[PDB]
Design a protein around this ligand. Structure first.
Ligand SMILES: Cc1cc(Nc2cc(N3CCN(C)CC3)nc(Sc3ccc(NC(=O)C4CC4)cc3)n2)[nH]n1
Length: 274
């Protein structure tokens, strides 16, 4: 894509190495690298682009075009009017800017549908959360399949020097203990994400616990002596939906529901629960 065809209007967001801008060509979102981006970051950007080229789904952000011929590299994606899912839900209250319970189901169902698509490709997202989802017009939800280290969500990641930055509060117990990331662990993360949506993003998962306590909690899952703790049922969440969350947090990976079952529950079975 010709970079000259792009007209920059606003800077939406930024990370350690990248910046997202609103651009006119028709609005698109454009991720560009910082002027002080390392060649390491450039290489990561290229890899990121190659991954995105594969993922084509109504509920996955799409790669509309690239500008990699010159520095800094550009990635062009859907512009989503309402920004990220976390910030969107935080600005809303449950219906007595309001959002209804049926809509929350619809939002989660779209996420589930996006993850269902990724599952058929055996693609593991590894960082599913409301902060990595986007909201367009008509409550359209798309999962972001690229990353950016925004300072706003620094507290959502566990940092140790020389280690990978890990979203431990969204990670399955076998993830925390082994670094074992699979589709089954994506399901666990979906459960936490579903919890966020029903909480309307009013609280961080295990928010009153420290990182080390969350890590220790994963050890209690492994041990299985009935001392592990779960995220509590959100006020807006009915028991039946919550039991679904719990199945996502089963100790055994094979006991966690596939995204096909999760989507069916949220899009169909729960329609009678309103
Ligand atoms: C990438 C993308 C971003 C967007 N849309 C938007 C839109 C937006 N604005 C919407 C309009 N109001 C007035 C202000 C906020 N603010 C952000 S702020 C922002 C910046 C980046 C991300 N997402 C990411 O960085 C990827 C890592 C998850 C989310 C929101 N992103 N559409 N497509």
């Amino acid at each position: 894509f010709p970079r000259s065809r792009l007209r920059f209007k606003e800077k939406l967001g930024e990370g350690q190495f990248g910046e997202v801008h609103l651009c006119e060509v028709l609005l698109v979102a454009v991720k560009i690298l910082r002027p002080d981006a390392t060649k390491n970051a450039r290489n990561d950007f290229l890899k990121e682009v190659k991954i995105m080229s594969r993922l084509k789904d109504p509920n996955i952000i799409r790669l509309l075009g690239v500008c990699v011929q010159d520095d800094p590299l550009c990635m062009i994606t859907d512009y989503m009017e309402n920004g990220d899912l976390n910030q969107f839900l935080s600005a809303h209250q449950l219906e007595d800017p309001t959002i209804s319970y049926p809509m929350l189901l619809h939002v989660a169902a779209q996420i589930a549908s996006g993850m269902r698509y990724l599952a058929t490709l055996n693609f593991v997202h590894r960082d599913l959360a409301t902060r990595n989802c986007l909201v367009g017009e008509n409550f359209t939800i798309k999962i972001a399949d690229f990353g950016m280290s925004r300072n706003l969500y620094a507290g959502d990641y566990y940092r140790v020097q020389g280690r990978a930055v890990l979203p431990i509060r969204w990670m399955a117990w076998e993830c925390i203990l082994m670094g074992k990331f699979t589709t089954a662990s994506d399901v666990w993360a979906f459960g936490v994400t579903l919890w966020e949506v029903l909480m309307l993003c009013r609280a961080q998962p295990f928010g009153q616990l420290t990182d080390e306590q969350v890590i220790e909690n994963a050890g209690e899952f492994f041990r299985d002596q009935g001392r592990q703790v779960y995220l509590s049922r959100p006020p807006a969440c009915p028991q039946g939906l919550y039991e679904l969350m719990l199945r996502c947090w089963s100790r055994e990976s094979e006991q966690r529901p596939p995204f096909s079952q999760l989507h069916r529950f949220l899009a169909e079975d729960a329609l009678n629960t309103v």
